[PDB]
Symmetry: C6
Subunit: 219 residues, 6 copies
Amino acid sequence: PIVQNLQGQMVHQCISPRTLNAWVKVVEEKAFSPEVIPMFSALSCGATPQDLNTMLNTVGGHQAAIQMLKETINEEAAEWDRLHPVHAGPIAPGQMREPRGSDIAGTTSTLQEQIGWMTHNPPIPVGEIYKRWIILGLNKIVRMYSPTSILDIRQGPKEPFRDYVDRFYKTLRAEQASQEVKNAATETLLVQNANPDCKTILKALGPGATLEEMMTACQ
Amino acid sequence: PIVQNLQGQMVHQCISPRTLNAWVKVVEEKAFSPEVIPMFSALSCGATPQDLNTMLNTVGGHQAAIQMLKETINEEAAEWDRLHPVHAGPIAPGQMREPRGSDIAGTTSTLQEQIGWMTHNPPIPVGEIYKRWIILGLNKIVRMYSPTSILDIRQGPKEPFRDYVDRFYKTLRAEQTETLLVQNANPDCKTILKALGPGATLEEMMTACQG
Amino acid sequence: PIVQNLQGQMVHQCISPRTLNAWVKVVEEKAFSPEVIPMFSALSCGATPQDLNTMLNTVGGHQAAIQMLKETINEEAAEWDRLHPVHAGPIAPGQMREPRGSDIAGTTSTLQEQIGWMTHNPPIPVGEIYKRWIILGLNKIVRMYSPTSILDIRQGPKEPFRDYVDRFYKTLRAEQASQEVKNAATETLLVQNANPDCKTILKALGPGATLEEMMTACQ
Amino acid sequence: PIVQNLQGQMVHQCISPRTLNAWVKVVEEKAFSPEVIPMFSALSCGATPQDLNTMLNTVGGHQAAIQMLKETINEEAAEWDRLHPVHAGPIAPGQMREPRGSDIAGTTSTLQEQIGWMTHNPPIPVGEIYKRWIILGLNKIVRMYSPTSILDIRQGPKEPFRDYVDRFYKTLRAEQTETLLVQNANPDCKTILKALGPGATLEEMMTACQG
Amino acid sequence: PIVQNLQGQMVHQCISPRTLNAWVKVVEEKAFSPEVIPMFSALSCGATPQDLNTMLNTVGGHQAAIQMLKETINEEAAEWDRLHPVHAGPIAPGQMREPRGSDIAGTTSTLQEQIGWMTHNPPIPVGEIYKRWIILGLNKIVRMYSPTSILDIRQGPKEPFRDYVDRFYKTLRAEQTETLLVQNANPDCKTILKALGPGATLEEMMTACQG
Amino acid sequence: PIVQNLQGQMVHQCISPRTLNAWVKVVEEKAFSPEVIPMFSALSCGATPQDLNTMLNTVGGHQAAIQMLKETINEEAAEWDRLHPVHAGPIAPGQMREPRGSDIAGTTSTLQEQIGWMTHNPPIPVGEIYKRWIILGLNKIVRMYSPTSILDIRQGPKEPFRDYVDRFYKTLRAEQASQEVKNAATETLLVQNANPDCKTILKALGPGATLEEMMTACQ
Ligand SMILES: [Cl-]
Ligand SMILES: [Cl-]
Ligand SMILES: [Cl-]
Ligand SMILES: [Cl-]
Ligand SMILES: [Cl-]
Ligand SMILES: [Cl-]
Ligand SMILES: [Cl-]
Ligand SMILES: [Cl-]
Ligand SMILES: [Cl-]
Ligand SMILES: [Cl-]
Ligand SMILES: [Cl-]
Ligand SMILES: [Cl-]
Ligand SMILES: [Cl-]
Ligand SMILES: [Cl-]
Ligand SMILES: [Cl-]
Ligand SMILES: [Cl-]
Ligand SMILES: [Cl-]
Ligand SMILES: [Cl-]
Ligand SMILES: [Cl-]
Ligand SMILES: [Cl-]
Ligand SMILES: [Cl-]
């Protein structure tokens, strides 16, 4: 990654064995559960495009997801090229060439070039741009590998309401939807799919009851 | 987090894999036992709002608690907005816009903005403000997930007094006293404690009922 | 904790995950064996009152001991208030308010105030003062939870003298007594409670025999 | 490795026990699966030729692969010598002799010489040149140790399409496409994929054959 | 310990949780086998007397050995006092009082005083002096806890000579030679070693009795 | 070890618990397999003679090898004394006494003296000289403890050629021979000791076939 030294300068640092192992292990243990994505984002904090490719390439197996990831990356890279055409011309001494989509993705750019873009003033955050593409692709993989639909999450006749809300928002989280969609799904299904006894208790709370009040009422 | 380097400047530093793993593991092993909250506070020392959201988002499962957390955060964010109305106007050079509730919560603010507020002179500690909201929400989760009432913690007829006080104050901590303790002791220890008189310390009470 | 940087200044540093885990694990594995106290002291090296409260609060269970700990802290805090009454008046720019007992204990003082006291010239070591109170309370807990009295430590007819001395000073250590009391208990019980065969050998060594000579004689 | 300190100078640093153990363990657990190579590249970040030889030499067993590695290294070293003839002559003050192939490979060069080439202005990155040769040799080992041909990867009659694509591109990675994928799908999924038309993404193909 | 920072000044640093755990674990697993002493010396590198007392005090059990350690420390402390009589008088600015034996042992000296002696010019290495006393006491414990005499280490009639030399010098290290080795070899290897003549190296002796 | 700070000066640093544990564990798990030697060299990077003695002394058991190690060290130390006689005379202020063989081995030299030799300009690398002696002794131990001769490595009638080459060069590596000897042993035994079917295939490849071609041919 690119870290700041004690001279105020942003300096490249080697990816650590702790970071490499942590990412490999979380993929082995959790596959593509929704919480793997924020773990990837945090483990790739300050990462260069080279570091991001390293984390993706160190993953063994799951090559169907990795190949889908590469397709999303190429779609986003092509869009960047459509929006930012490179202007031919010799590069100035203190300047850097404008990055292509494949340069942001680390496939046609060197580490030195990525350091140059990231440590420029103003910086071109090719690592954060690339990470935005990878997470976009990881969101589709999580959504695709989600086994259960939110419509099929219904509270059992003897299931505690706490456990049913756990399954509800776990299934809802694997959708990788916006907060507006999450709130629309909550107002459409959480109360309506509760079991008969708890549903009656929740209807009498009104639409303005908080989840804390809802879980308390069906305790 | 935002840490001081070895020269004296407040500099952003990436959250470490050790910190990420420690928080994930303590939630996996302890869920939301009361001691998880001080662990969260210490692991999030100097954290930015982004770091706090990272720690919350890396938790798998417990999504009912996570959703309650988000509601408490939104309640506190709305209160901050009611108390700190935003003053429209262009931000001066070297200055920063006043943060909204959603800015403190890291949802409408960039990392650079959070670093700017935290490293300002005087600083606006959006990380500590956000952490205060999260811990407030985590306290509600602990109380809700507390299985036992303090009224049902009674010393067994042959239970050592030390073990009963352990269960008493463990239950009491989750439910978030000194005379209720004597009331729920067993008959034999209750008689000994009555003969101690008011003002006995817990050390003196436990000594008297050693058996 | 408060650590020194390379500018000669004492600077606050976040408590590390290694320190947090080490303290939690030693309490889980060793409870309140006597050697837990020096482990607590070392793990809390340079700790602020906030760090000390963090270590105590991260402990799950053992709440009877924790509650006794808080009582000892309050007794020591009240004594500090009796000995150091706070003088009302506005605080100077480069100065700090005098700490109360609850300020040393971290309950009515902020982290910034604790850093200010600890990094002052001369420093007010609220962390070391608080640690002195906690260890005082931990000493009472270890003494209370000690299962065996030193009077009941007697050498078996076929027990090796080495193992009996191990049990003797393990029991004696859980008393948390001064070295004078340890020496008084040694001169009163170690030889007198040895088994018949070894006791006769030790009597013929005289009161001036070292433990090395005593253990050698009954080998 | 050669790392930049916290002042800006490129300084040699000892290879860490964490790095040594990580490389030994990944070879023990994964042998020469394709993902071992990017792990080697990352663990050898900034490595000198001495560090690269250290990592290779700490591997126990797999000596047939290690011996193939040495042959590939010697082939690349000889090519470097053919392309960069050494110019005889005394080296000037503050200058360094041009490295031979065996110097890049760390066998005829001292650590000081490798540090000098890597920290020169302009630098001669003998570590990155050497690493390029090693990875070239590691690629040959992966290809040789690949057990299955892509022609033999066919979807089972009741095998989930997701698992078949996993095996397809795992085999394809070791053998180091989009229409071969459809050809080797089972009859039921093949009919669905034919009806998708050319230009379907892998996401669309996997969605269609979800079953 | 007292370590040099990255600018050149000797600065006190807290003993690390890694060091504390490593010392506790090696005592738990190895007790007082001879190799524990060099482990103690290395783990206590640059240690102050306070750090040395911390490491000794974190040991659970083995209190008979710990009590022998304290007696040896007191014997060495008394000798230091006999050799270095304290000169009464007020300490000058920027100066330090001469340490007593109990000051070197960390029992009557503060951490600041130990840092002052160790960082003085010239330094008084109370940590290294104290460590010398502890290792002297640890050597007595190893000798006392050594179970086997070198006289009872004899090669079995069918025991490999390599394993017998292992036991010989392991016992010899705990008891803290080259002809005793030949004397306690079995008849078959003894005849081979007699025919080697005096002056044979251990390598030559082990080669001759390879069997 | 001796590490460089951020002042350009070579400064002594304490051996780390990670390094101490790693060396002890690799000896426990791998004994004197050939790959233990490069692990020792890397773990002792920048080590002083004191650090090298620490690593050797922390090893429990294997005292026959340790005692052979000490004999090789003494032979190399005596040779150094024969080649570098010490010139008597008072040492200058900014100078250091010339090291003896026992000084390089850390037995008659202090840590400060070893730091002085290693950080001098020009430096006297007593750590690298001592490490050269230890590795020389470790090479003899590995060679002595090797169970199998290269002459007895023959391919089984149904053994894959890949596995036979593994055993060949594992046995050959435990000889600790020069690359010339390794190439001479390869040209003398690898093809000649292959099984009948693979041997005929390899003879038809010619002496100029690479190992990659040889392993491919007998796949
Ligand atoms: Cl690391
Ligand atoms: Cl995986
Ligand atoms: Cl994310
Ligand atoms: Cl790859
Ligand atoms: Cl880490
Ligand atoms: Cl808290
Ligand atoms: Cl998320
Ligand atoms: Cl840590
Ligand atoms: Cl516990
Ligand atoms: Cl203590
Ligand atoms: Cl708490
Ligand atoms: Cl390390
Ligand atoms: Cl690669
Ligand atoms: Cl080697
Ligand atoms: Cl640590
Ligand atoms: Cl030692
Ligand atoms: Cl103690
Ligand atoms: Cl360490
Ligand atoms: Cl061993
Ligand atoms: Cl080597
Ligand atoms: Cl030793």
